[PDB]
Symmetry: C3
Subunit: 485 residues, 3 copies
């Protein structure tokens, strides 16, 4: 007697198929990554720029609360709190702010350089400050910026700088807006004042916009800041009859590509990732994850799913081809060295001897299937999270519509891929068994009796060397013509 059978174990693993729910399977693999390392990590060897709770404007201008900040020269992304507490301490706005943040998102190379030393505003006053930028407890000011009247005169302030630094240079400036016609005079004397900034491509003329304004940080005046990239060997010319907030410093900058600002309160921790999320770093081969939408790096596709389990083993029983959980009604706890095999009854003994030839063919296939699903995913470097001013709501909605669109596609396709491939994995196993049963049946023929539950009853004594011929497809029909029927 020799039976064909398949593996069963104590697994409680469940998968879903197109056709069935909660099907207990022999072995499985989750292709959805859900674990991170809880650390904020550096990205391919380069750390993030950590802004504490300063805004980028606060940092670049030199808000006094950003004094103890720690400026690395390289950085691969930026960490900023959702709502930083130290930004424009003197109230105001920053032209094209979001475009600026996007520029500084990742950097070569970034170095602050003194370009217009303050002591050389010889004909103007330099120490103007404000209680809004106070340093316990005297009036101070943005440390990287500087001009008010000298006596009762404010000559035309006019300086220029040639970018001899060998790199592209960020440069920021501002114009002040007083509270009312008077206040202006006590600050700049003249009235029809202007601020003029120009380069090879830049040219701009601002005039003070006076208005009555509530007090922010105790002030009613405002400062509006602008910025430019000054190309190498180009010069920038400042000219002002008043209200100019001048830079003392510029910033050498070089860039490879772009990255993103990650909103979080976590802090750099000394590890590596190819993929960062505001919750922690992801290290995975898997094509999908559900940790968090706002990742930076080379990441798996984010998916709304919270389970993507591929079946690798077979239906686990205590079928398209009618064998597994079919005409062979049960699995074997006993066979523990393969997925399909034989169970013999002999004068010598019995009887579990797994079929290595076919079990490998399946291990290979199911291996290759899992790898196809994984190895076909194209994962380039992306940032995801973006920034939009309060008058770019539509644009922000477009971006959201886009991110939601791709989320739905990947979720749907991953969910369906898993369901379909699972149905086909179970059917694969069923077919592997059915064919084993057929390979024996087509080998014995008259020499055995098909019992019904997966077994052949031999019409002759079949010792061990006999089985070792049927198990390996060498059984010879002619050698047996004992007819007990």
């Amino acid at each position: 007697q020799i039976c064909i059978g398949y593996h069963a174990n104590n697994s409680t693993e469940k998968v879903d198929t197109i056709l069935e729910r909660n099907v207990t399977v022999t072995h499985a693999k989750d292709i959805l990554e859900k674990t991170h390392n809880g650390k904020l990590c550096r990205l391919s060897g380069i750390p993030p720029l950590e802004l504490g709770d300063c805004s980028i404007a606060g940092w670049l201008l030199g808000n006094p609360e950003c004094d103890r900040l720690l400026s690395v020269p390289e950085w691969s992304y930026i960490v900023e709190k959702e709502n930083p507490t130290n930004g424009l301490c003197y109230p105001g706005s920053f032209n094209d702010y979001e475009e600026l943040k996007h520029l500084l998102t990742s950097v070569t190379h970034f170095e602050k350089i003194k370009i217009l030393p303050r002591d050389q505003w010889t004909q103007h006053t330099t120490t103007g400050g404000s209680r809004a930028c106070a340093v316990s407890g005297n009036p101070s000011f943005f440390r990287n910026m500087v001009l008010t009247k000298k006596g009762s005169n404010y000559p035309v302030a006019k300086r220029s700088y040639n970018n001899t630094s060998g790199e592209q240079m960020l440069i920021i400036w501002g114009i002040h807006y007083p509270n009312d016609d008077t206040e202006q005079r006590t600050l700049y004397q003249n009235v029809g004042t202007y601020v003029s900034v120009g380069t090879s491509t830049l040219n701009k003329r601002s005039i003070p916009e006076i208005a009555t304004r509530p007090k922010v940080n105790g002030q009613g005046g405002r400062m509006e800041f602008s910025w430019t990239l000054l190309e190498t060997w180009d010069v920038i010319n400042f000219e002002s009859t008043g209200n100019l907030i001048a830079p003392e410093y510029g910033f050498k900058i070089s860039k490879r590509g772009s990255s993103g600002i990650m909103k979080t309160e976590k802090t750099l921790e000394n590890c590596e990732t190819k993929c960062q999320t505001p919750l922690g770093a992801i290290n995975t081969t898997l094509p999908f994850h559900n940790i968090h939408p706002l990742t930076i790096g080379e990441c798996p596709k984010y998916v709304k799913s919270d389970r993507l389990v591929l079946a690798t083993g077979l239906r686990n029983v205590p079928g398209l081809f009618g064998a597994i959980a079919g005409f062979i009604e049960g699995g074997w706890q006993g066979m523990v060295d393969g997925w399909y095999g034989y169970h013999h009854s002999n004068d010598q003994g019995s009887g579990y001897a797994a079929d290595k030839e076919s079990t490998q063919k399946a291990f290979d296939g199911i291996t290759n299937k899992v790898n196809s699903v994984i190895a076909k995913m194209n994962t380039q470097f992306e940032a995801v999270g973006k920034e939009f001013s309060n008058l770019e709501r539509r644009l922000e909605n477009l971006n959201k519509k886009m991110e939601d669109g791709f989320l739905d596609v990947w979720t749907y396709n991953a969910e369906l891929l898993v369901l379909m491939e699972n149905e086909r994995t179970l059917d694969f196993h069923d077919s592997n068994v059915k064919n084993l049963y057929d390979k024996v049946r087509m080998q014995l023929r008259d020499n055995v009796k098909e019992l019904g539950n997966g077994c052949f009853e031999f019409y002759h004594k079949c010792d061990d060397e006999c089985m070792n011929s049927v198990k390996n497809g060498t059984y010879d029909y002619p050698k047996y013509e004992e007819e007990s029927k």
Copy 2:
């Protein structure tokens, strides 16, 4: 004699598979929604704001043609005609108009408040209007705004403030008048170096009027430019002008849960309900796909270019991969009406149609799951779709179209192919169940019966209605029947 067979009927329902076109199928399910209710409905309990044929600008400003408008405090989307007839009755422009529309798209909560009553402009004339905005047939003006003009030969500095104590964020709109010529300026305002000044915590603006000759629109060379701000709670807005200020009298308390969209159509609201609205009518459906109209609002099926997505649910209709259906069992049974597969027995007693409950149920279960899988996995959140761009945003509008088109092509392709593939496997599924049923009987009989051809066994013994039972329910015993009439 017992025979294995499968169900057939008078269906003409057709599906396509990867391998075959135009296949007649026993039962089918269309997973593409194609019908709408032609009504314009309220969305999850909340109505649209209906603008008649006013524009948002005319509504907010208080164009007198928008008097009968009917304002609601809540609304879940906006209905606006493609080209409304009543907007800026006095010609002009609205700064960041589209951003402002986008804001008003979906609203909590919305309430007009009188923040700067006309009568307190005591040092200026307030009744100034224009023939451009005439009410049969005297000069009028936008009802929510105040056209400050001179009183006598004077226009003192106009200066007022409002602190937002209203408990909610407040939309406020103002305007500056650009006169056609120097006389219109003097007769209206007296002064000449005029300016308008508006400031809040975050807002800071100063505008000076531009006198210049312009073609006449609605009989006016002058133009009015309007701007808006959201005034945060407990903040204040300060207005100051030496002339040319079009002041608000009112502000709008606004709260927002989320956002929505404007629906461009001629239709009107109509006392029904949906979770999904299109400019042609509402959609009530379980289905994952529709082809009614791309510009929907709400929780909607995916819009696809396709116009037939039919899933096979039953089997090939025959009045395969496993070789049974339209195969070694050459045809189906019109007569077996209680299941998908079953037996036909010939007995000394009777004969003889009997559905196989067990395996038919396996199939009802599996095909149910399959349809439920295709439908239940579709992730349908709330979206607006339609969007607004100015004439200087062609590129951005084009980016949006390229994106909507991109998703359309993806969903269309995927759905069409999903249907083709899953159809192929459904047929083969049924085929497989018939082959297995056949084999479940053969392995039971063996010697006790002979295999005839198309799914029939001829018993080598008498088998009464009680024996047939043992076969149909798998409890047949070989031993009991050792009559070999072979």
Copy 3:
């Protein structure tokens, strides 16, 4: 004897499936297009506007180096060098430049018309030029524009208008000059507090000069900033200036059906035809995917990040899920050449390869439908892909890239997995057809033959060449050959 076998040949063609790699197949089909004709062609009958190495700005303003450009009246897309050498010869900027380029991307119909003849500027000097816009080698200027300067010591108000009586929407460009200093302002315009004022029905703009020291670009410290508008049919445009106006002499009649793209390349129009153009050449194809170049214009296959998409059409080439091919019938027959599956017979007469035309045809039709389904379901509409952004639209640009990349990922994945899943099913399909051919004969011969193994039956009787054909064409009477050697 009677044997059931299958086609084999000298194919080195390889495919991949979900389950196996580098599987040698009988016949295959590549669905990824990789060839182009390396030419810049006309698009559906219509040429591209060819800018040589001028920029659109240079061209529209009339840079002297753009004189010999050849202006077709129609064009379906634009050809521009990645970085043109002839643009604003006199330094400056162009307001809303990308929007203008996107507008001119594709055109009906487009013709230049003289709207404001130079000599009618009677109170002004009209011939001012620059060394920056010089023609070997005297100072010249943008040929389509007029640099109004003073006559003697006077610059009276400059004031002209134009009614668009041309019958089409008209493009009009003007500029304002920003001098280097007060003294340069005075020698050109006399007056110091100047303005440029332009108005239509919907446009109203007032510009004032920003005099200021700048580095020299093309030897010039000054700049010119140009603006543009579309003047509607029968509308008028008012120009008014006290100095610094760069007036248009010409306007551009323009009409549009739709929109298109700019193709950045060095290549030049070469006189052919395409529905699909890339910067590397045109694509003539039926296939659903290509990997030539992402920036296409026209109706194009989906661009995929893949270099092989190979569908199996034939079978596993053997010198399975159903256990027949490379299973219990261990190898394929190089012999049988006129079919995919067939029979081999041992006889006393001939012997004997005969292909089953009936079974083979069912398969040819099915795989034909499969390939066609994959190809014919793909929707290809006209798009431009390449887009343009100023350097203060980095975010918008990155948004566009995020989107293009996203569809790129989706299509690649879906196509790669499509090919693999359908290959696993194509092989199994052949395997099923062979297994079914075998069973079709087995269920026909029953006791009259013995089941050997390699899919061969041993006849228990003389079966001459005519008996064979009763098996092959599935019409074989068992009644007849009731002879017993067992």
